Enzyme design. Sequence first.
Site, short mmCIF file in Angstrom:
data_model
loop_
_atom_site.label_atom_id
_atom_site.label_comp_id
_atom_site.label_asym_id
_atom_site.label_seq_id
_atom_site.Cartn_x
_atom_site.Cartn_y
_atom_site.Cartn_z
N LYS A 1 1.93 -2.25 9.43
CA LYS A 1 3.12 -1.39 9.20
C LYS A 1 4.33 -2.10 9.79
CE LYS A 1 5.12 2.79 11.19
NZ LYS A 1 4.87 4.19 11.59
N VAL B 1 0.86 -1.22 0.00
CA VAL B 1 0.00 0.00 0.00
C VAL B 1 0.89 1.26 0.00
CG1 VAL B 1 -1.35 1.31 1.73
CG2 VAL B 1 -2.26 -0.81 0.78
N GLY B 2 1.91 1.33 0.87
CA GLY B 2 2.76 2.53 1.02
C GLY B 2 4.21 2.20 1.37
N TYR C 1 10.47 5.56 7.34
CA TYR C 1 10.23 5.01 8.71
C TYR C 1 9.50 3.66 8.68
N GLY C 2 8.93 3.25 7.54
CA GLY C 2 8.33 1.91 7.40
C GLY C 2 7.70 1.61 6.05
N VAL D 1 4.16 -0.52 4.43
CA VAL D 1 2.77 -0.88 4.85
C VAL D 1 2.15 -1.84 3.83
CG1 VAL D 1 0.44 -0.06 5.50
CG2 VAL D 1 2.45 1.34 6.03
N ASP E 1 -1.68 9.38 12.91
CA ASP E 1 -0.34 9.93 12.53
C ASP E 1 0.07 11.04 13.50
OD1 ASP E 1 -0.07 8.12 10.42
OD2 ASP E 1 0.09 9.71 8.88
C1 LIG Z 1 -0.72 0.63 9.97
C2 LIG Z 1 -0.38 1.54 11.09
C3 LIG Z 1 0.32 1.09 12.19
C4 LIG Z 1 0.72 1.99 13.19
C5 LIG Z 1 0.36 3.34 13.04
N1 LIG Z 1 -0.35 3.81 12.00
C6 LIG Z 1 -0.70 2.92 11.05
N2 LIG Z 1 -1.51 3.37 9.95
C7 LIG Z 1 -2.91 3.68 10.27
C8 LIG Z 1 -3.86 4.16 9.16
C9 LIG Z 1 -3.54 3.56 7.79
N3 LIG Z 1 -2.44 4.29 7.16
C10 LIG Z 1 -1.05 4.13 7.60
C11 LIG Z 1 -0.80 4.27 9.10
MG LIG Z 2 -0.08 11.32 7.58
#
Ligand SMILES: Cc1cccnc1N1CCCNCC1
Ligand SMILES: [Mg+2]
Length: 348
Positions: free
Chosen positions: A49, A26-27, A31-32, A34, A164
């Site tokens: 993630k 997806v992304g 920093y990671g 997904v 976020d």
């Molecule tokens: C997958 C994840 C883990 C920890 C923190 N935030 C996360 N996502 C949540 C919404 C989807 N978009 C990307 C960020």
């Molecule tokens: Mg954001």
Amino acid sequence: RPTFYRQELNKTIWEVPERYQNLSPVGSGAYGSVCAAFDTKTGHRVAVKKLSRPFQSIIHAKRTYRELRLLKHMKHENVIGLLDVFTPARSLEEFNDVYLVTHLMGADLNNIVKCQKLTDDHVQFLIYQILRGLKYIHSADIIHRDLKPSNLAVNEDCELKILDFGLARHTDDEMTGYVATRWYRAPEIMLNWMHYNQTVDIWSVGCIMAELLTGRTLFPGTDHIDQLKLILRLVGTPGAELLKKISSESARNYIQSLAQMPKMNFANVFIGANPLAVDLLEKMLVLDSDKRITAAQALAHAYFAQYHDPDDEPVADPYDQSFESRDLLIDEWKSLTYDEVISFVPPP
Ligand SMILES: Cc1cccnc1N1CCCNCC1
Ligand SMILES: [Mg+2]
Ligand SMILES: [Cl-]
Ligand SMILES: [Cl-]
Ligand SMILES: [Cl-]
Ligand SMILES: [Cl-]
Ligand SMILES: [Cl-]
């Protein structure tokens, strides 16, 4: 311990419990990485993630620990929560990789403010939910620091979650020029005027609310200085009382070089808006952060009368952030993180 399986997805090894199926990228970021997946235990379409280089430096190891602590604490209907956390490691000695699992989000606010017709009733419900989530976040003495439309997830039923959180991650280059990363920031943090606190988040809510009412960015500055000029033309130049609270002498000298301007008439800027919406914007978009409305005060404003329920606006459990002032080695931050992965308990 569950059974884990391995696969390569866009140049990366993923080792995950059998419960997570049909992984698809997806992304990508610094920093990671997904993937979307189907969680067979819960039936949820989940977001997973994988962290990149989580223990590569003291700064990076502490940021990993900070993110895992913050996300495990957040248990509210209008805030991101953790469904799961895991590592394929069987001991601290072989621990390298951390994976975080949340609900998969579809649309963000951008995907509904750009292309959809919003009634005043939609604006009331969307801003109510942001403030309900912020009352909870601020009750734990957490500052989000990065509220903007791309950090707000919204479903088909207009239901909203904050995500976020700012993990103190944004670079000088990211904040430079004609960029949405700066248009929602309070002037005291944009220009490093003073020690900031939780009031910075209410400025961002004002900017978001204005953009839902007009369909246009409130302060789309081409750089820090252009953006400050747009802000002072609406709210007015500072008086002696705020100037005394600005700690940088050069920041105070610069403000005093600008011609004085009065606060504008918000009913002539937000033409035809609900008068109660205009009143609430005048209480959020106050230059002196000490004088801004709080999240708990805003929930009681007459604009939200059809949604406000003071028996269904919960506060958080206490949050210990004493680790933020602690000086540790990479391996000490790594052990703290490991303990938090192994002690995780999933939601009901
Ligand atoms: C997958 C994840 C883990 C920890 C923190 N935030 C996360 N996502 C949540 C919404 C989807 N978009 C990307 C960020
Ligand atoms: Mg954001
Ligand atoms: Cl499993
Ligand atoms: Cl959630
Ligand atoms: Cl590992
Ligand atoms: Cl955005
Ligand atoms: Cl705590």
